Symmetry: C2
Subunit: 319 residues, 2 copies
């Protein structure tokens, strides 16, 4: 019936057309230390965030899931201002970026898993900090080729919180690995497959890997459209090829699409070197609508299917 | 002549009796993510910080160096309130805690070392964030048994900044390793030995290691008095034994003492288990004065020598 947004509970039937994964603000953990030369400018950042939101609305987007982790500059009050300014629904997350010393220490104390669970529960059902704003998703990540014991604590805490709240879990997979293992581990700890999104699945170009992941009944996200040439992320050409194969296999009810944009970078400004700058030129919130979707239609993907991915799937995911 | 404190430039001759290493606030990197259950309470934190300062002033302490790193909750405006409240001089640092994603990324961009140098220079000569408060020390750290290439970037940036500003460098060594290598690397990049403090040297109990470090002409700090209880980690009894040997070798002009206290922990509150708790029971700002110093005097250490360590050495270090 309802889902927690940065503006409070909203009927799931009102979410409409949704981008499952985009960042209004993002900083890599550590950006905090570089505050002097990387100061946050609120007015300019809000202006940029709002322009990005208006671009999305132009393409009919009504809802954005912004899963910026707790240590990556997640700012619920800022996201509420963006929502208030634009009428967009924005759903935020609780979780940590892809071990940090704070949690090495609580592991020592032996309280880490319970502390993480308590954190998830507080942010899902009480509010983040003193904002009164609640997260609607739990964000998780694992390592390349392995789900470490550290990471499993988070997975276990997430499974517990998911069982109590019915919140959605969104994961990050590293370099196209551990999709099946993520789903299996969550399910083995009681998590609901219909409330799980295995993310960055576009990082793998082997359809068998996807089918193995999809067999668990979870959602999967091709959530990095526009990102090419870095991380050894595949090309958009490769993403589309993989997507087309799955869609022609009838998997549209388990697939969602996004760009993983960072519209305002936190910390010190930078500029990408010339070779990558060009490969990364389509990495913006309009890319799916101006480039990818028309290419899909040319390959015979019907509106029905597209609507299922952008509207049907988020509705079912959050209900 | 002058040193930058959180209240601005102060004559070095007014520093007087000094604790070279104590934290008013500290959180392990990652504490930021746990804001909801680990909210910073300003009034209570200030009250606790000020009480700690007043305990130090009771033992004649007039200056504290608080080298809390940039990513560990360093809060110059807070430290200035403590100083204003108590009359203490407080000198803060610029540096990162003992590679986080932010700097892995700038390493990719190839600008990391220059960025770190720029950061040091800005914080030493302009001010931290918008506070107008300048650091007086550069804080550095290396790994157990190795100074990594990542860490060496910081060391190189620090050496450059030190040559330009004459600022002091304070290091963290991990588990009694790399003292000599730290001094050698800094000196090889032009840093001034009389402006360097190799920290946590109390972590090693082999006097030859200390003498090898001292041979470079740097200061060394026994800066963790009261910290005891980890298996294989040094006891206060062991610290005193090592210290006594060096003092009887005539090294008092290169040695400084501290506790490395954390008076207010940032992030979620915790309680140490009963056994470790009892071992850690002397970890407070009065410990050197009520326990360690009287024990030194019983072993024949004269006031002259103690005065050199607590007053003479910091004066020479910062001048
Ligand atoms: C430029 C490389 C791509 C990138 O920065 N991805 C970021 C976006 C948010 O989560 C990530 O890891
Ligand atoms: C409670 C155990 C001791 C401990 O955590 N010391 C910490 C505090 C400051 O930097 C240290 O290394
Ligand atoms: Fe992301
Ligand atoms: Fe310290
Ligand atoms: Mn991601
Ligand atoms: Mn340290």
């Amino acid at each position: 019936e309802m889902v927690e947004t940065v503006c409070g509970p909203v009927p799931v039937e009102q979410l409409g057309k949704t981008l499952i994964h985009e960042h209004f603000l993002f900083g890599y953990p550590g950006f905090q230390g570089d505050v002097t030369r990387g100061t946050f400018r609120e007015d300019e950042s809000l202006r940029v965030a709002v322009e990005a939101a208006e671009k999305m609305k132009r393409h009919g987007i009504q809802t954005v899931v912004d899963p910026t982790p707790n240590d990556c500059g997640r700012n619920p009050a800022f996201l509420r201002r963006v929502a208030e300014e634009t009428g967009l629904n924005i759903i935020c997350a609780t979780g940590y970026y892809y071990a940090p010393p704070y949690f090495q220490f609580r592991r020592l104390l032996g309280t880490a898993e319970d502390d993480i669970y308590d954190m998830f529960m507080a942010e899902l059902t009480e509010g983040i900090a003193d904002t009164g704003i609640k997260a609607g998703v739990i964000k998780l990540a694992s390592s390349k080729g392995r789900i470490t014991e550290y990471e499993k604590m988070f997975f276990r805490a997430a499974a517990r919180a998911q069982k109590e709240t019915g919140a959605v879990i969104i994961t990050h997979t590293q370099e196209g690995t551990m999709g099946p293992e993520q789903a299996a581990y969550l399910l083995e700890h009681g998590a609901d497959p219909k409330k799980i999104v295995i993310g960055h699945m576009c990082g793998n170009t082997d359809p068998d890997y996807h089918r193995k992941t999809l067999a668990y009944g979870v959602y999967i996200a091709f959530d990095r459209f526009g990102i090419q040439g870095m991380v050894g992320a595949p090309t958009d050409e490769e993403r589309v090829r993989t997507l087309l194969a799955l869609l022609r296999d009838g998997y549209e009810k388990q697939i969602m699409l996004s760009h993983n944009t960072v519209n305002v970078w936190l910390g010190r400004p930078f500029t990408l070197p010339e070779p990558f700058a060009e490969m990364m030129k389509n990495w913006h919130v309009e890319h799916l609508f101006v480039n990818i979707i028309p290419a899909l239609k040319n390959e015979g993907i019907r509106d029905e299917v597209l609507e299922q991915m952008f509207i049907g799937n988020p509705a079912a995911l959050f209900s």
